[PDB]
Amino acid sequence: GLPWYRVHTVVINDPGRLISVHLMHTALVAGWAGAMTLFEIAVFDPSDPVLNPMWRQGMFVLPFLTRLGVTQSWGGWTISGETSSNPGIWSYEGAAASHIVLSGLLFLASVWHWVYWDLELFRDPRTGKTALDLPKIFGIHLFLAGLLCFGFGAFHVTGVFGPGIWVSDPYGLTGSVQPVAPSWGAEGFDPYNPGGVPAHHIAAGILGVLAGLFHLCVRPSIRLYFGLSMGSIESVLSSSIAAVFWAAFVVAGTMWYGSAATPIELFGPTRYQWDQGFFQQEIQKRVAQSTSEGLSVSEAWAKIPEKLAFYDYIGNNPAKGGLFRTGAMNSGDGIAVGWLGHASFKDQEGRELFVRRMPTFFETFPVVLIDKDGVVRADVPFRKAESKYSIEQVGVSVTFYGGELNGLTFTDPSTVKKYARKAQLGEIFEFDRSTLQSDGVFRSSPRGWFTFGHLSFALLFFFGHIWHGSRTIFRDVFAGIDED
Amino acid sequence: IGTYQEKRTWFDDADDWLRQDRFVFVGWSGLLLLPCAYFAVGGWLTGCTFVTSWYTHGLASSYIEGCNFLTAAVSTPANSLGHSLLFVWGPEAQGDLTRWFQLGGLWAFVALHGAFGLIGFMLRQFEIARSVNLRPYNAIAFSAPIAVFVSVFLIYPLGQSGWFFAPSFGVASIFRFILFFQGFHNWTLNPFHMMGVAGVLGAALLCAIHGATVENTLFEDGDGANTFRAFNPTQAEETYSMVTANRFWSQIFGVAFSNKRWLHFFMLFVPVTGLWMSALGVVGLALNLRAYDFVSQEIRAAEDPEFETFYTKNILLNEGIRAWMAAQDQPHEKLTLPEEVLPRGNAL
Amino acid sequence: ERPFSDILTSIRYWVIHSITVPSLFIAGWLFVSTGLAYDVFGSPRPNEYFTEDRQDAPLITDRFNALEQVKKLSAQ
């Protein structure tokens, strides 16, 4: 009979069980969502929202909770730093409880639809055989999709009824959930502009409503009916799975490149920001201003926010982990406790040297000290024999400003080597390690894991769409060929 | 069609002129497959004789510079261009073909047209299978080459900094990319890669064993030593003794196939599974998610100076690979690493 | 049907291809020997391999002004 890889084809032509299994899949997904955010709240550490944010703890569904407007919790804390005096019914684990009760209702509806499968709704009054009115079903579903998209874009994100969305500054410092006005121009098509999302959803909802009305009105033709295998529900299956790995490639791309609905504050940075020196450029021009007008680099480094220096760290890079460096980033390097300041290195004659920033492609990198003109002045000596670039013979001292260590100049070769190795990764931070048994290597961000999983899922669904296309066009010769 | 009148129109005339017997089948899929594949092969064969890499990678990659067949390659665009498609009309070139060649834009051109050629070839397989009505398991098995193509020529550069880390169209350039994954990614230690290599060597196993077994358990059909003419194209009887094959492999190997259909389908199954898992592995590599370090082994190697293993030898050889890579493979980093900082052993 | 057997053995096919193939070979010879590939292509000759300004490999290091940048970094 049917093999193990064909078991679900017992419900190919049974709409009651099709609705039932869709209901219980919906129940399982909602229950997983609730259980996952309950686990994330149970293991979340809100001790430091700046130096130990959610994406440093491997929080996966919680950044998506904070994306749409849910920021407070019933535990009396909000991720932005404020205290939730009246967090309301819609907290993180409150939304979890909503997902759980929805899952229970969907499971009960699934059992009901399984036990009541012989519904006359699935029987057409023409001949009485099993059939589904696919054009009208799609017209109705497109109408509901357009209505929901228009409502979500006209009331939720506009803030006249909903909470709006989480918009942050370009460098991800402050961050806030607020209503966003629509952007009706090319700026609305700017992928980093949050003003396009309400306009996008409003226009998409209007177009979907009109298209669904036209589908409800006009019936299809015979030619496409016999061409696209319209009579088979598997055609709907192949087209829908094509659409969903289309959207999977879309979400993987927008998460890896960053956009308006992908905040750095909630989902972690991108590797391209590190490779483009975004936070470093911000800090250094914040230094150039207020250093070019007095109050030199001895002070005003404390004027640099500590979140910015945490952003200027390759351990904060989403593409520094591994396939199997499993878990939270804090379990990888420890929880950051404080910023020690920007290391300024100076050799024996007076020029200011700089450590080369580590490329994202490398797991290890040599430590070198380069002049302003771009030629290496010193290095950590591997050979140490007939070497005339070593720090022990060049005489480079390291000084710090504006952090836990300020104005302190180290001249000892061992400590200047160690702090040069630490500054090789970017900024200089102290990490607590014994509390979570940190192994030492870097982990990956939730954004990176999201992108990897969705890329793999998109490839698998491309294979599935090819297989279902073969299944749709070749529904007549499966068991064998016509032998004539 | 469908016992209705169906007055013939432009679509009907096009279909009737398109799906017919020729020396080369055109069909509907030939509207894309023929121009896209022709453009891809023409661009590559032009690149391996003409296109210099002196301004893209700062290398020599064509016969016009004196390179041979392997060292000739269509070279990737510069990483400063990022993930730009490098149109000849676009802001990179702005209508100037001559400097569009020096930009390396034909890499993106040929890669795009080759992706569309792969799509057109699968569509041609589907259209032929529809035209003369048998199952499209050729397209089902062909789903894996396009997965490999996407996952290594688009997914990896799009995950990384840009097309510069994408492989270049050329044998020695593919070798450079392969050693690049050996050093930077430890691609040998990747689990999905071991899945793929196991599948591909098993595919070689099944192909060799199936051909040898069929040609070695043949029936007589003879009165002549040339058994090739012993086969007739029109016969409904077996040509090789499968039951003898089953007994031979049951007594040699312990297990044997009891079905030609399952045998042939598993022969289909092994390389498609291998290539799909390799595609998933390089997709994982696209975002710097590698099977690089074994945490416990590196820990015990750190607190044990005697604990030497082949895995630690591989790890050390890989950072040596990367230390020698960076300077001469990444011009846009202009890493002027001195000779002393390069790790090396005694003597040599 | 002419299944690749009578065509190559036909004197009519051979005579009309006694000129076109050598003409294509000669044109391909001259297209490289006269430097037209170097002109319309942008490939550098070994004599103009390096400029006097830079002794090293060229680096574009740009995305939008790369057209005029390769204009000023090529061999003119």
Partner: peptide, 27 residues
């Protein structure tokens, strides 16, 4: 204040900053 001094300050750290990738045709 001066963009040329911060350019030469970012260069020894990394040669892929956006400000180094923009308006560097003068160099």
């Amino acid at each position: 204040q001066r963009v040329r001094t911060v350019l030469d300050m970012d260069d020894p750290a990394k040669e892929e900053t956006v400000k180094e990738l923009r308006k560097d045709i003068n160099n």
